[PDB]
Design a protein around this ligand. Structure first.
Ligand code: 2VN
Length: 260
């Protein structure tokens, strides 16, 4: 790993630490011991302290869904800044930057969600709440079907024991996929992708000498995320169609529009 490549890995890591409010070290410090949301009584208590304005109120499941949409809008914003640290990203055509982020953001979201999940629940609301996995399963259909596949992905992803230095590069690689539909400058993106993937490979070799297959394991996780997002988008479409009170924020509507 040349000084240039080591420096690119550090640039990407620092961009991740600066641009995401939650990092995995911070999340683990908190999860080691937030207000616990495990039932309807504690949901409504948390709403009154953490999202006071939101609480004529909607059904609980629809309130939770609205709050989730707010966090997605914010994460999409954070991922947009972050992507500028990727060599060549800001030099790409504005329209290609849109296409890459369009397909990439939810893969990045579900990868990063793993850092705040354990087998019993997830840290939420900027580190101030913890919602149990069983509570989310108790919601009425279809809302109970949103988070469980994400916990299942996260348990196996977390068993890889990645740190923030690895995850920042993996999120950059997700954004760089040169096989998204609609790309204008596939060739330049493939070269941008190759550069990030090359740094990811070398960094995993340095940082995880104990796991000689970690790079292909992460390529497979990328593919698993793409399929997780496809399925997620299908469920979101069901909710939007069948749930009168579950309208999508316009930014998220645009992200899902014509996605899959
Ligand atoms: C919104 C759809 C339509 S479905 C969808 C998508 C994503 C999620 C996970 C949202 N979430 C829980 C946010 C929970 C808020 C909490 C609810 C109870 C009262 C207190 C506030 C959360 O913490 N996300 C992290 C954010 C940091 C970066 C990693 C992701 C849930 C549903 C979408 O597709 O966007």
């Amino acid at each position: 790993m040349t000084a240039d490549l080591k420096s690119l890995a550090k640039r990407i890591y620092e961009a991740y630490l600066k641009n995401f409010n939650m990092n995995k070290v911070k999340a683990r410090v908190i999860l080691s011991g937030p207000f616990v949301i495990h039932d309807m009584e504690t949901l409504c208590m948390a709403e009154k302290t953490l999202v006071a304005k939101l609480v004529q109120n909607k059904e609980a499941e629809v309130r939770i869904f609205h709050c989730c949409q707010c966090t997605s809008v914010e994460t999409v914003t954070e991922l947009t800044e972050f992507a500028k640290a990727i060599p060549g990203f800001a030099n790409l055509d504005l329209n290609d930057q849109v296409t890459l982020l369009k397909y990439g953001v939810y893969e990045a979201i579900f990868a990063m969600l793993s850092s705040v999940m354990n087998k019993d629940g997830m840290l939420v609301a900027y580190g101030n709440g913890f919602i149990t996995r069983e509570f989310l399963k108790s919601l009425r259909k279809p809302f109970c079907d949103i988070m469980e596949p994400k916990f299942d992905f996260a348990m196996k992803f977390n068993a890889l024991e990645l740190d923030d230095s690895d995850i920042s590069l993996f999120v950059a690689a997700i954004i760089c996929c040169g096989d998204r539909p609609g790309l204008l400058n596939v060739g330049h993106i493939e070269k941008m992708q190759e550069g990030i993937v090359h740094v990811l490979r070398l960094h995993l070799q340095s940082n995880h000498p104990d796991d000689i297959f970690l790079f292909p394991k992460l390529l497979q996780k990328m593919a698993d995320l793409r399929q997780l997002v496809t399925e997620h988008a299908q469920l979101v479409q069901i909710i939007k169609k069948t749930e009168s009170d579950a309208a999508l924020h316009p930014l998220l509507q645009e992200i899902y529009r014509d996605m899959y």
